[PDB]
């Protein structure tokens, strides 16, 4: 009388439901298992976003955008490199020139 | 390839397309003895007094 | 734990940054260290000077 | 900052010119004072942030 997705049995039931779908050569048990698994996946992903609804959601948006602004800051620095091509004199770097 | 590869994880372009498209290669140590390898791509494949001008690979 | 997404690695109490690549044998993680050896099927002419032989074509 | 090894874009004249735009000595030295007497140390000390580690060999 106790439901199986309550509470921590969620992932174990996910793999066991995949195993019950795979063990069956009958299409009916496979389709019932696929529907039960998609429903359990949606319920668990909703529960997971609701708990991550606050303060983890906020740092995902900042990281997603910080690497985005690094791919932006990189290309703008590259254009700044290409534009500052007037004269490159200063000493503290060397390089090989063979034969 | 740089632009398609910048838009990976937004669709599905990856390293295996660089290998399949014929851009990078897996060279190994017994075969590395007959490559003529450039270290950076611009700077060793430019035009001066010649060092080799027959490079066959270039390092990433 | 394979092809398994990242919520589920954490639901099984695992870390998604674990690389893998090791065995659990009696609850110990064991790694197999790669051992090098000589290439087989290949002729190598050496020269041991500390014997009766001038040359040696191992294979 | 970026400290990849073989990089041609970074050198020490370039870092030094940036450091002197934030109002420091371009070579990283600063003027410290003695903590016990308060008097300036006549050598300028080379201070800045470095990443330290803490090794597992505690006493």
């Amino acid at each position: 009388f106790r439901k199986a997705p309550p509470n921590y049995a969620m992932k174990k039931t996910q793999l066991l439901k995949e195993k019950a779908m795979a063990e069956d050569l009958g299409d009916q048990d496979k389709a019932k298992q696929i529907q039960d698994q998609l429903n359990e996946l949606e319920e668990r992903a909703e529960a997971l976003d609701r708990q991550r609804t606050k303060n983890i959601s906020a740092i995902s948006y900042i990281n997603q955008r910080n690497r985005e602004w690094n791919i932006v800051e990189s290309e703008k620095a590259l254009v700044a490199e290409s534009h500052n091509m007037k004269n490159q004199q200063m000493d503290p770097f060397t390089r090989r020139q063979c034969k | 390839h740089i632009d398609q590869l910048k838009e990976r994880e937004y669709n599905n372009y990856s390293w295996q397309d660089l290998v399949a498209s014929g851009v990078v290669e897996y060279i190994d140590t017994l075969e590395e003895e007959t490559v003529m390898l450039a270290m950076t791509p611009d700077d060793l494949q430019e035009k001066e007094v010649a060092y080799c001008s027959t490079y066959t690979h270039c390092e990433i | 734990l394979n092809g398994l997404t990242d919520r589920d690695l954490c639901e099984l109490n695992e870390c998604p940054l674990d690389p893998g690549g090791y065995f659990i044998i009696n609850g110990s993680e064991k790694v197999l260290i790669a051992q090098e050896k000589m290439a087989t099927n290949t002729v190598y002419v050496f020269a041991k000077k500390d014997s009766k032989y001038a040359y040696t074509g191992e294979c | 900052g970026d400290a990849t090894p073989f990089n041609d874009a970074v050198n020490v004249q370039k870092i030094s010119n940036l450091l002197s735009d934030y109002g420091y000595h371009l070579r990283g030295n600063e003027v410290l004072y003695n903590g016990f007497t308060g008097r300036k140390i006549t050598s300028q000390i080379f201070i800045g942030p470095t990443y330290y580690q803490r090794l597992k060999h505690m006493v």
């Binding site: 990189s74 | 740089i2 590869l5 990976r8 990856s14 | 893998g20 | -």
Partner: peptide, 28 residues
């Protein structure tokens, strides 16, 4: 069309794609 001196940004895209596809312990 070729990629010139805009190349440190492009040398590391192929490195990042390599390490997405193949982890570090793929040889095991």
């Amino acid at each position: 069309e070729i990629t010139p001196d805009l190349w440190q940004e492009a040398c590391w895209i192929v490195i990042s794609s390599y390490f997405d596809e193949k982890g570090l312990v793929r040889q095991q």
